[PDB]
Amino acid sequence: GAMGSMERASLIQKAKLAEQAERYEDMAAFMKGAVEKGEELSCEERNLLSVAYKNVVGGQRAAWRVLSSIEQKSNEEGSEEKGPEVREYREKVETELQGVCDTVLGLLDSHLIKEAGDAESRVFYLKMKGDYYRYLAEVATGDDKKRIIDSARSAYQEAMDISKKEMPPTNPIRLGLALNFSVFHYEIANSPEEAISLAKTTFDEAMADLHTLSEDSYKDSTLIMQLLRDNLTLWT
Amino acid sequence: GAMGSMERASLIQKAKLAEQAERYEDMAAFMKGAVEKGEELSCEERNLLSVAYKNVVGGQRAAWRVLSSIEQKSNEEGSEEKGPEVREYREKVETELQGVCDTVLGLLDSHLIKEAGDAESRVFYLKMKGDYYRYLAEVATGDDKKRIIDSARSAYQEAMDISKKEMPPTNPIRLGLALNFSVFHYEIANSPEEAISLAKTTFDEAMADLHTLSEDSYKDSTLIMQLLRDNLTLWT
Amino acid sequence: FPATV
Amino acid sequence: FPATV
Ligand SMILES: *CC(=O)NCC1CCN(C(=O)C2(Oc3ccc(Cl)cc3)CCNCC2)CC1
Ligand SMILES: *CC(=O)NCC1CCN(C(=O)C2(Oc3ccc(Cl)cc3)CCNCC2)CC1
Ligand SMILES: [Mg+2]
Ligand SMILES: [Mg+2]
Ligand SMILES: [Mg+2]
Ligand SMILES: [Mg+2]
Ligand SMILES: [Mg+2]
Ligand SMILES: [Mg+2]
Incomplete structure (x- = not known):
């Protein structure tokens, strides 16, 4: 306004x-x-x-x-x-x-x-939707906590499905989404095994695709891969 | 409200x-x-x-x-x-x-x-008054800039006069006031010599009174004395 | 706390 | 910038 x-x-x-x-x-x-x-x-x-x-x-x-x-x-x-x-x-x-x-x-x-409509924009917004429902979930203590958690899960899942079909495994949006969804699993959904599996698989699939990248793309992807590794280290 | x-x-x-x-x-x-x-x-x-x-x-x-x-x-x-x-x-x-x-x-x-009415309260508030007029002076560019600067000077001066009569030279309020008034001189009033003289005299008079203090009072006073020294080092 | 972006 | 308190 x-x-x-x-x-x-x-x-x-x-x-x-x-x-x-x-x-x-x-x-x-x-x-x-x-x-x-x-x-x-x-x-x-x-x-x-x-x-x-x-x-x-x-x-x-x-x-x-x-x-x-x-x-x-x-x-x-x-x-x-x-x-x-x-x-x-x-x-x-x-x-x-x-x-x-x-x-x-x-x-x-x-x-x-x-x-x-483009994968990069849609995935980015759906990730945001998951993130802001996750923040609501962090403080939720009442009747709607389950629905709030499910709203985060659903947004992240839609983003994941699109990202896996439409983006390479090194794409920074795909990586950042996976990082955050992994945190959702660990911190919100009481699913540490899912969190760990997601972070590991995301890291390893990205590692295998680094060879296709320019120096600058490599820098972008490896930065987020390091965050995945950091979380795995925290959790294992 | x-x-x-x-x-x-x-x-x-x-x-x-x-x-x-x-x-x-x-x-x-x-x-x-x-x-x-x-x-x-x-x-x-x-x-x-x-x-x-x-x-x-x-x-x-x-x-x-x-x-x-x-x-x-x-x-x-x-x-x-x-x-x-x-x-x-x-x-x-x-x-x-x-x-x-x-x-x-x-x-x-x-x-x-x-x-x-007590020196410690009155000096503290008058120092604040000088400080907030100094912040107004930092951004002032118009007809009232001189009056704003003078309002800061007047508040600081009243605080100084009371502090010198009523408080020991190591008192943290007296020290902090002098530190800030010195900065006023350097940064606002285009009086670097006054700034330097004030910081030096304040430091030296405090040094001479440290012997009267407890360990805890010594800690408080010497912390602010170090800020005076830091500014003197910046300016000389 | 874990890393997010 | 100089120190103030
Ligand atoms: C419009 C667009 O494509 N944005 C994606 C950018 C990728 C690079 N990038 C980053 O790597 C940092 O932030 C991110 C990364 C991934 C997502 Cl999904 C969101 C933000 C990595 C963390 N520090 C800030 C830059 C910026 C976004
Ligand atoms: C109520 C009262 O007497 N307050 C004075 C305190 C003196 C100790 N002190 C400090 O030394 C610090 O902050 C100051 C110091 C002097 C003034 Cl005038 C104002 C604030 C020194 C800088 N870091 C924070 C504590 C607290 C006030
Ligand atoms: Mg227009
Ligand atoms: Mg509430
Ligand atoms: Mg899966
Ligand atoms: Mg009452
Ligand atoms: Mg203006
Ligand atoms: Mg004088």
Whole structure:
């Protein structure tokens, strides 16, 4: 709404400035405005959108974890009653986080995903959808937790199916999707064996395809392969 | 306004939680609410107020500097015209920064300073007043720049006069005030000689009084003395 | 915490 | 940039 009067190109320019200034809330607002112009996003623009919201929600998740840890400690035996404030403030942060997730999911549903026909764009958006449902799942404790988890799983699965048919095993989007879906399995779905299998198979299939790549493509792919290895090391 | 329904003690508790979560905007809002209850602040509470706003405005200043540098580069010979966006976004950040400064100055004027009778509280608030006028001066380019600079100078000078009469030369508030007033001289008032003299004299007078201190007081004083030395090294 | 992108 | 507190 607030960005309705600003040119699409100006919003994109300002998002890039906001990134340079580490003003990620501004960056996300600019990119939301750009999406709401209704035109499809280029690859560079999709990256700006994802970076902005990743940074905003990343900060909220880190804060939520600090507060949840304090709250958990407050409910241990021998802990002095300090009143409702810790729960209230964790709830405040949680609600803000859920709001950001809902905003991103809204942009994806209205109408980024439905207009995305190329594998690279569709997989990228479906990965995002899985990611923001995963963040909702991290804080979910109620009646809809199972449905939230399943929404993440379904988005990731659709992205996986397309990526396996349409993209090479070294494609950074395919790799990043697999990395994140593997984390979903480990941290959300209580499926560490699936997480480990996915990370290993993804790594090994990428390794076998590196020979086809330029130096620059090799750099991109191997960076994400190292993240897969890092997680495997953490988990084994 | 928004914090009007929350207990003073709950606002203070939540400010401390916000600090632990590195949620400095929240921390500042909680502390603003606490000030607006109308009671004087304790030493711990004054520290919470200062930490919150220092962090918020610190981030805005860093962003403003990034954007101002890009803008300055855009006005050099051979730079391609990119339109009004860089100036607009620097202005946006600038306006937000000025707003935060105005908020802090408002709390000091209504009514923290006038109710502060003890040297330690009055000097602390007057230092803050100098600091937030200094931040306004950093971005000022118009008719009132001189008056803004003088407002910072006057606040710092009153704080200095009280600190020299009422506090020992090792007192961390006296030291921090002198550190910041020295920076004011160097960076704002175009008076590097005054800056250097102030830092040196403050350091040497503190050195001579360290013998009177406990181990813990010595730690506090020497930390700030090292900052004075760091600045002297930068400037000489 | 594990790596995601 | 110089140190302030
Ligand atoms: C439009 C498009 O194709 N974007 C994909 C880019 C691939 C390279 N890249 C990265 O490698 C980093 O971020 C990613 C990677 C993969 C996904 Cl699905 C999302 C983001 C790797 C992590 N550090 C930042 C760059 C950027 C996206
Ligand atoms: C209520 C009160 O007396 N506050 C003063 C504290 C002195 C110790 N202290 C510090 O040394 C640090 O921050 C300062 C120091 C001086 C001033 Cl005027 C303001 C803040 C030194 C820099 N790192 C943080 C602690 C805290 C305030
Ligand atoms: Mg237009
Ligand atoms: Mg809740
Ligand atoms: Mg499978
Ligand atoms: Mg009350
Ligand atoms: Mg202006
Ligand atoms: Mg003098």
